[PDB]
């Protein structure tokens, strides 16, 4: 009658994430009904239905002035480890995982006065020797022309382009699964105003959301701070 | 006779690119013709002409070259015909194979060169899609290869999945002159991604 | 404006083809993430004798640079059950302990807590005394020996015992009528109860408390704090990793 | 020409009657062959303290005169899951260790890796410190004691975590934009992750890593390297064996 | 309620090839679709659908010259441990196993010029005192006449003839399950050419494939190199 059993070598070990529960010692507790609004079941949903502001030089926006042209106003490399993605929800949620997949949605909100106007060219530049320095260079790439004064807000989707099905959350010296290129914003025209003495500059807030195809996998433990 | 390497080519776009994919039609990715080299009497069995596709000859692929050059990723197969120009008094035989992820090349990476294969390799190169080119029977080899790689597409600047190996199994004997090895390459079902900046 | 691609008109954007699923968002699932053992806390054993204090199981207001700490701070209200793993690691010579029983007692939210040694065991002259509240009874008592133990641990599941329908991880108000700086983000009973580790070892070693949160429910998402510093403008953080260029 | 037998005409061959099946080719099955534990690697334990480095699980480019080494080199692309057996064999006196806990941490492909002792356990004066990344949490931590242990081992299954749909065993290109002799047959993440063995033993002994590859899939066969030298022309290799003439 | 169980003596042991899995600690990972051509599931299939070249004196072929006759041009004993089977796929795959069963298919490819011709007699000689030295001796055995200039390639099947159902992969001093005989190729006529000064010799490539009834069993671990 006693059952012949063979003890596996990994026998008395711990294994932290076993797919099984411990023995219960305090049964039959019926818990009170928890009505309470706003329950969420998956972090990816709040990442997709919500936006955070980027950290451009410590502020949540870049500026256009009545003197601008050529040079890029905003530039960030496409990696969740990028600096301008620092204080964001999507970037911060990501540190819990090893890999990501999908697009990021950026939306720019021009907060310059109603008496103010400017036009922007926003480009997604794929991995390359070295990042364009002027807009005539970048305009060969995927880009959109944002004329404020048509819509004060503009959404741009940074796509996912890679031979790998997922890329790394934690970047490092450039690898083929580390970085996906750059996102740049140029001034197609400098800020014009009704009176340059009253309005000389206007600020574009830049916010990020997880794209519809965005996903995160492989939960990871936090490494030494840096 | 046409040999399909592993399978027939497909025109399916890469599963891992959410950005616009451009399908190069046949009249755009045309066809290019090269002389691989000359097979001499002095060269011995095991010697091979290694032709990764394309990477050292991309600059000579006219139209295809211009388009590929301006984009980041490319998915595409190849249609190659290797030929040999020998008389009916020449003896010898080659084995021309299409090898996925070929490596040895001592990092003369992605450059068409010549090496001496290591025996177990020349003996077993037939294990890869190939065709024998016996000088007493035929003068051509025709191989068609599908896109292949660890991911759904690549960057031809950093990776050449397919490399054509033309290997000497039976040395050239007969009339003193050499036998030129020739090759036509045509990109097939080419798809291109993400345009790069202007070259200023 | 115009919407989709290649005319380059103002407001017009180019075509994007969304990617197909693969992973199914399984890993970003709240209850999946929390149903695993986390090494939260480490604690000292009390001697069998005296008047020890119970340790409250409250993993909520943490600052620890650990994944459970931030994660538990991502919502405003929380509900989950609990599982524990208690281990015991020597800090002296393992041969100091020849028997080493450890009494563990778990207390539901609201349980009375004053204990003093009161239960005497007698044998051949010498005697042993254990706490009033270490004895096996109404609430769970677990007893494990550390000596030859192949794992010097114990473990069990316990339910949500709070009186609140949900635990407020953040509370804009006071938990007591007297509004003392103390009772500020407070609310009594916003926890899992308390435990009492008691043993003749006490010196000789410590414990290792791991929590597992089965059946987790989170309410009202909140901002998630950074974890790393901000790299320089227009750069990327670069971390050591599995992948990395050799 | 003529085909079948006994006229001896040019091109004619004699009759052959193929043999009936018996074994059914079960043993030459790719996934059957790989689903067993292989002693690949042997490795040293890191001390609990300091800033240890993780060991990457990459059995792919091996030269080892062992059956798994060549076999894994028979295809161009590979996919499989993984199982591990970690054992621990003393290289000193078994009585040196009175407790000997060993913390094992496994990391999925792409995981951050910088660790320094940071979790303190306290007990009776003396204290013990373990790595930031040895603690139980998000990724699996296994803890086994070597002391009285009847097998001084542990073991568990882990899945394919790479981002590549398939691992390239051979890669004609570079894994990084900078084309350094280093990143040549490379490609980041073409592996099973990494582990971190940490213990107060560390000196005193080493490990023994065995891999098992359930659900293996191989793509594009490649040449299989010889294993033995070439005997003389027209002879046969003669090896010691079970059978052999006494 | 606790179940009466009896611990087997082989209890805490290892046993490397147990038909069972270990406990999983990192659940729910959905793996990306792996399209990729050329998957193979059984090594015997690639051994049968593929050919390798033999190693005759280090070259993948034997030669006929305008001076030949009698003596054997190629001779190899039927054993996977044979020298001329050295660099082959079938021989190399075999070292992973203890026993084999079935036939081997050899095909000779004459690569002498089109202006060249010769005839070969290929014989399968069963185990015997000592191997024939001339073709008039071997021709009493199973043999085929290959007239090049009829077909430039010729396939010959070395049969399986033995009282045992399987033979040994790893040969040694001759036993009843070690060796199955010899494969020999003779020149029925010497090489003739249109001009002996231009073509004096021709090479026959010899390739091997696993026969249709070929099989391998008993996976074995690699012994000390030799």
Coordinates of N, CA, C and O in Angstrom, one line a residue, chain E residues 23-129:
Chain E
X23 N 10.8 21.2 -13.2 CA 9.7 22.2 -12.8 C 10.0 23.5 -13.5 O 11.1 24.0 -13.5
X24 N 8.9 24.1 -14.2 CA 9.1 25.4 -14.8 C 9.0 26.6 -13.9 O 8.1 26.7 -13.1
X25 N 9.9 27.6 -14.1 CA 10.0 28.7 -13.3 C 9.7 30.0 -14.0 O 9.7 31.1 -13.4
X26 N 9.6 30.0 -15.3 CA 9.3 31.3 -16.0 C 8.3 31.0 -17.1 O 8.5 30.9 -18.3
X27 N 7.0 30.9 -16.6 CA 5.8 30.6 -17.5 C 5.4 31.6 -18.5 O 6.0 32.8 -18.5
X28 N 4.4 31.2 -19.2 CA 3.7 32.0 -20.2 C 4.4 32.8 -21.3 O 4.0 33.9 -21.6
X29 N 5.5 32.2 -21.8 CA 6.2 33.0 -22.9 C 5.8 32.5 -24.2 O 6.0 31.3 -24.6
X30 N 5.1 33.4 -25.0 CA 4.7 33.0 -26.4 C 5.9 33.4 -27.2 O 6.3 34.6 -27.2
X31 N 6.3 32.5 -28.0 CA 7.5 32.6 -28.9 C 7.1 33.1 -30.3 O 6.0 32.7 -30.8
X32 N 7.9 33.9 -30.9 CA 7.5 34.4 -32.2 C 7.5 33.4 -33.3 O 8.2 32.4 -33.2
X33 N 6.6 33.6 -34.3 CA 6.4 32.6 -35.4 C 7.7 32.4 -36.2 O 8.4 33.4 -36.6
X34 N 8.1 31.2 -36.3 CA 9.4 31.0 -37.0 C 9.1 30.3 -38.3 O 8.8 29.1 -38.4
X35 N 9.0 31.2 -39.3 CA 8.7 30.8 -40.7 C 10.0 30.0 -41.1 O 10.1 28.8 -40.8
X36 N 11.0 30.7 -41.6 CA 12.3 29.9 -42.0 C 12.2 28.5 -42.7 O 11.9 27.5 -42.1
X37 N 12.7 28.5 -43.9 CA 12.8 27.3 -44.8 C 13.8 26.2 -44.3 O 14.7 26.5 -43.5
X38 N 13.6 25.0 -44.8 CA 14.6 23.9 -44.5 C 14.7 23.3 -43.2 O 15.7 22.9 -42.8
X39 N 13.6 23.2 -42.5 CA 13.6 22.5 -41.2 C 13.7 21.0 -41.4 O 13.2 20.5 -42.4
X40 N 14.5 20.3 -40.6 CA 14.6 18.9 -40.7 C 14.3 18.3 -39.4 O 14.5 18.8 -38.3
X41 N 13.6 17.1 -39.4 CA 13.2 16.5 -38.2 C 14.0 15.2 -37.8 O 14.0 14.8 -36.7
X42 N 14.6 14.6 -38.8 CA 15.3 13.4 -38.5 C 16.6 13.3 -39.3 O 16.6 13.6 -40.5
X43 N 17.7 13.1 -38.7 CA 18.9 13.0 -39.4 C 19.0 12.0 -40.5 O 19.8 12.1 -41.5
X44 N 18.3 10.9 -40.4 CA 18.3 9.9 -41.4 C 17.8 10.3 -42.8 O 18.3 9.9 -43.8
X45 N 16.9 11.3 -42.8 CA 16.4 11.9 -44.0 C 17.4 12.7 -44.7 O 17.6 12.6 -45.9
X46 N 18.2 13.5 -44.0 CA 19.2 14.3 -44.7 C 20.3 13.3 -45.1 O 21.0 13.6 -46.1
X47 N 20.5 12.2 -44.5 CA 21.5 11.3 -44.9 C 21.2 10.5 -46.1 O 22.0 10.2 -46.9
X48 N 19.9 10.3 -46.3 CA 19.3 9.6 -47.5 C 19.1 10.5 -48.7 O 19.3 10.1 -49.8
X49 N 18.7 11.8 -48.5 CA 18.5 12.7 -49.6 C 19.7 13.5 -50.0 O 19.6 14.4 -50.9
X50 N 20.8 13.2 -49.5 CA 22.0 13.9 -49.7 C 23.2 13.0 -50.0 O 23.2 11.9 -49.5
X51 N 24.2 13.5 -50.7 CA 25.4 12.7 -51.0 C 26.7 13.5 -50.6 O 26.7 14.7 -50.5
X52 N 27.7 12.7 -50.2 CA 29.0 13.3 -49.8 C 30.0 12.6 -50.7 O 29.7 11.5 -51.1
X53 N 31.2 13.2 -50.8 CA 32.2 12.5 -51.5 C 33.2 11.8 -50.6 O 33.4 12.2 -49.5
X54 N 33.6 10.6 -51.1 CA 34.5 9.8 -50.3 C 35.9 10.4 -50.3 O 36.2 11.5 -50.9
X55 N 36.8 9.8 -49.5 CA 38.1 10.3 -49.3 C 39.0 9.2 -49.8 O 39.4 8.3 -49.1
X56 N 39.3 9.2 -51.1 CA 40.2 8.2 -51.7 C 41.6 8.8 -51.7 O 41.8 9.7 -52.5
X57 N 42.5 8.4 -50.8 CA 43.8 9.0 -50.7 C 43.8 10.4 -50.5 O 44.7 11.1 -50.9
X58 N 42.8 10.9 -49.8 CA 42.7 12.4 -49.6 C 42.0 13.2 -50.6 O 41.8 14.4 -50.5
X59 N 41.6 12.6 -51.8 CA 40.9 13.3 -52.8 C 39.5 12.7 -53.0 O 39.3 11.6 -52.5
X60 N 38.6 13.4 -53.5 CA 37.2 12.8 -53.6 C 37.0 11.9 -54.9 O 35.9 11.8 -55.3
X61 N 38.1 11.3 -55.4 CA 37.9 10.5 -56.6 C 39.1 9.5 -56.8 O 40.2 9.7 -56.2
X62 N 38.9 8.6 -57.7 CA 40.0 7.7 -58.1 C 40.3 8.0 -59.6 O 39.5 8.7 -60.3
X63 N 41.5 7.6 -60.1 CA 41.8 7.9 -61.5 C 42.0 6.7 -62.4 O 42.3 5.6 -61.9
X64 N 41.7 6.8 -63.7 CA 41.9 5.7 -64.6 C 42.9 6.4 -65.5 O 42.8 7.7 -65.7
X65 N 43.8 5.7 -66.1 CA 44.8 6.3 -67.0 C 44.8 5.4 -68.2 O 44.1 4.4 -68.3
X66 N 45.6 5.7 -69.2 CA 45.7 4.9 -70.4 C 46.5 3.6 -70.2 O 46.7 2.9 -71.1
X67 N 46.8 3.4 -68.9 CA 47.6 2.2 -68.6 C 47.0 1.6 -67.4 O 47.4 1.8 -66.2
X68 N 46.0 0.7 -67.5 CA 45.4 0.2 -66.2 C 45.1 -1.3 -65.9 O 45.8 -1.9 -65.1
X69 N 44.1 -1.8 -66.6 CA 43.8 -3.2 -66.3 C 43.6 -3.7 -64.9 O 43.1 -3.1 -64.0
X70 N 44.0 -5.0 -64.8 CA 43.9 -5.8 -63.6 C 43.6 -5.4 -62.2 O 42.6 -5.9 -61.7
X71 N 44.5 -4.8 -61.6 CA 44.4 -4.3 -60.2 C 43.3 -3.4 -59.9 O 42.7 -2.8 -60.8
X72 N 42.8 -3.5 -58.7 CA 41.6 -2.6 -58.3 C 42.0 -1.1 -58.2 O 43.1 -0.8 -57.7
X73 N 41.2 -0.3 -58.7 CA 41.4 1.2 -58.7 C 41.0 1.8 -57.4 O 41.6 2.8 -56.9
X74 N 40.0 1.2 -56.8 CA 39.3 1.6 -55.6 C 39.0 0.4 -54.8 O 38.5 -0.6 -55.4
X75 N 39.3 0.4 -53.5 CA 38.9 -0.7 -52.7 C 38.7 -0.2 -51.3 O 39.4 0.7 -50.8
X76 N 37.6 -0.6 -50.7 CA 37.2 -0.1 -49.3 C 36.5 -1.2 -48.6 O 35.7 -1.9 -49.2
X77 N 36.8 -1.5 -47.3 CA 36.0 -2.5 -46.7 C 34.7 -1.9 -46.2 O 34.6 -0.8 -45.8
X78 N 33.7 -2.7 -46.4 CA 32.3 -2.3 -46.0 C 32.2 -2.3 -44.5 O 31.9 -3.2 -43.8
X79 N 32.4 -1.1 -43.9 CA 32.3 -0.8 -42.5 C 32.2 0.7 -42.5 O 32.9 1.4 -43.2
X80 N 31.4 1.3 -41.6 CA 31.3 2.7 -41.5 C 32.6 3.3 -41.0 O 32.9 4.5 -41.1
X81 N 33.5 2.4 -40.4 CA 34.8 2.9 -39.9 C 35.8 2.9 -41.0 O 37.0 3.2 -40.7
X82 N 35.5 2.6 -42.3 CA 36.4 2.5 -43.4 C 37.0 3.9 -43.6 O 36.4 4.9 -43.2
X83 N 38.2 3.9 -44.2 CA 38.9 5.1 -44.4 C 38.3 6.0 -45.5 O 38.1 7.1 -45.3
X84 N 38.0 5.4 -46.6 CA 37.4 6.1 -47.7 C 36.0 6.7 -47.4 O 35.6 7.5 -48.2
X85 N 35.4 6.3 -46.3 CA 34.1 6.8 -45.9 C 34.3 8.0 -45.0 O 33.4 8.6 -44.5
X86 N 35.6 8.3 -44.7 CA 35.9 9.3 -43.7 C 35.3 10.6 -43.7 O 34.6 11.0 -42.7
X87 N 35.5 11.5 -44.7 CA 34.8 12.7 -44.6 C 33.4 12.8 -44.8 O 32.8 13.9 -44.7
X88 N 32.7 11.7 -45.1 CA 31.3 11.7 -45.5 C 30.2 12.1 -44.4 O 30.5 12.0 -43.2
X89 N 29.1 12.5 -44.9 CA 28.0 12.8 -43.9 C 27.5 11.5 -43.2 O 27.5 11.5 -42.0
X90 N 27.3 10.5 -44.0 CA 26.8 9.2 -43.4 C 27.8 8.6 -42.4 O 27.4 8.3 -41.3
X91 N 29.0 8.6 -42.7 CA 30.0 8.1 -41.8 C 30.0 8.9 -40.5 O 29.8 8.4 -39.4
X92 N 30.1 10.3 -40.7 CA 30.1 11.2 -39.5 C 28.9 11.2 -38.7 O 29.0 11.3 -37.5
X93 N 27.7 11.1 -39.3 CA 26.5 11.0 -38.5 C 26.5 9.7 -37.7 O 26.1 9.7 -36.5
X94 N 27.0 8.6 -38.3 CA 27.1 7.4 -37.6 C 27.8 7.3 -36.3 O 27.4 6.6 -35.5
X95 N 28.9 8.1 -36.2 CA 29.6 8.1 -34.9 C 28.8 8.5 -33.7 O 29.2 8.3 -32.5
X96 N 27.5 8.9 -33.9 CA 26.7 9.2 -32.8 C 25.9 8.0 -32.4 O 25.2 8.0 -31.4
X97 N 26.0 6.9 -33.1 CA 25.3 5.7 -32.8 C 26.2 4.5 -32.7 O 27.2 4.5 -33.3
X98 N 25.7 3.5 -32.1 CA 26.4 2.2 -31.9 C 26.2 1.2 -33.0 O 27.1 0.5 -33.4
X99 N 25.0 1.1 -33.6 CA 24.6 0.2 -34.6 C 23.9 0.8 -35.9 O 23.2 1.7 -35.8
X100 N 24.1 0.1 -37.0 CA 23.5 0.5 -38.2 C 22.9 -0.7 -38.9 O 23.2 -1.8 -38.6
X101 N 22.0 -0.5 -39.9 CA 21.3 -1.5 -40.6 C 21.0 -1.0 -42.0 O 20.8 0.2 -42.1
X102 N 21.1 -1.8 -43.0 CA 20.8 -1.3 -44.4 C 21.9 -1.2 -45.4 O 23.1 -1.5 -45.1
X103 N 21.6 -0.6 -46.5 CA 22.5 -0.5 -47.6 C 23.0 0.9 -47.8 O 22.5 1.9 -47.3
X104 N 24.1 1.0 -48.5 CA 24.7 2.3 -48.9 C 24.7 2.4 -50.4 O 24.9 1.4 -51.1
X105 N 24.4 3.6 -50.9 CA 24.4 3.8 -52.3 C 25.6 4.6 -52.7 O 25.8 5.7 -52.1
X106 N 26.3 4.1 -53.6 CA 27.5 4.8 -54.1 C 27.3 5.3 -55.5 O 26.8 4.5 -56.3
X107 N 27.6 6.5 -55.8 CA 27.5 6.8 -57.3 C 28.7 7.5 -57.8 O 29.3 8.3 -57.1
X108 N 29.2 6.9 -58.8 CA 30.4 7.3 -59.5 C 30.1 8.2 -60.6 O 29.1 8.0 -61.3
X109 N 30.9 9.3 -60.7 CA 30.7 10.3 -61.7 C 32.0 10.4 -62.5 O 33.0 10.8 -61.9
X110 N 31.9 10.1 -63.8 CA 33.1 10.2 -64.6 C 33.3 11.6 -65.0 O 32.4 12.2 -65.7
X111 N 34.4 12.3 -64.6 CA 34.6 13.7 -65.0 C 35.7 13.8 -66.1 O 36.2 14.9 -66.3
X112 N 36.0 12.8 -66.7 CA 37.0 12.8 -67.8 C 36.3 13.6 -68.9 O 35.1 13.6 -69.0
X113 N 37.1 14.2 -69.8 CA 36.5 15.0 -70.9 C 35.5 14.2 -71.8 O 35.5 12.9 -71.7
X114 N 34.8 14.9 -72.6 CA 33.8 14.2 -73.5 C 34.5 13.4 -74.6 O 34.0 12.5 -75.2
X115 N 35.8 13.7 -74.8 CA 36.6 13.1 -75.8 C 37.3 11.8 -75.2 O 38.1 11.2 -75.9
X116 N 36.9 11.5 -74.0 CA 37.5 10.4 -73.2 C 36.5 9.3 -72.9 O 35.3 9.6 -72.9
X117 N 37.0 8.0 -72.7 CA 36.0 6.9 -72.5 C 36.8 5.8 -71.8 O 37.9 5.6 -72.0
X118 N 36.1 5.0 -71.0 CA 36.7 3.9 -70.3 C 35.5 3.0 -69.7 O 34.4 3.5 -69.7
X119 N 35.8 1.8 -69.3 CA 34.7 1.0 -68.8 C 35.2 0.4 -67.5 O 36.3 0.1 -67.3
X120 N 34.3 0.4 -66.5 CA 34.6 -0.1 -65.2 C 33.7 -1.3 -64.8 O 32.6 -1.5 -65.3
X121 N 34.3 -2.1 -63.9 CA 33.6 -3.2 -63.4 C 33.6 -3.0 -61.9 O 34.6 -2.8 -61.3
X122 N 32.4 -2.9 -61.3 CA 32.3 -2.6 -59.9 C 31.7 -3.8 -59.2 O 30.7 -4.3 -59.5
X123 N 32.4 -4.3 -58.2 CA 32.0 -5.5 -57.5 C 31.9 -5.4 -56.0 O 32.6 -4.7 -55.4
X124 N 30.9 -6.1 -55.5 CA 30.7 -6.2 -54.0 C 31.2 -7.6 -53.6 O 30.5 -8.6 -54.0
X125 N 32.3 -7.7 -52.9 CA 32.9 -9.0 -52.5 C 32.5 -9.3 -51.0 O 32.9 -8.5 -50.2
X126 N 31.8 -10.4 -50.8 CA 31.5 -10.7 -49.4 C 32.7 -11.1 -48.5 O 33.8 -11.3 -49.1
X127 N 32.6 -11.1 -47.2 CA 33.7 -11.5 -46.3 C 34.4 -12.8 -46.8 O 33.7 -13.8 -47.1
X128 N 35.7 -12.8 -46.8 CA 36.4 -13.9 -47.3 C 37.8 -13.9 -46.8 O 38.3 -13.0 -46.1
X129 N 38.5 -15.0 -47.0 CA 39.9 -15.1 -46.6 C 40.7 -13.8 -46.8 O 41.3 -13.3 -45.9

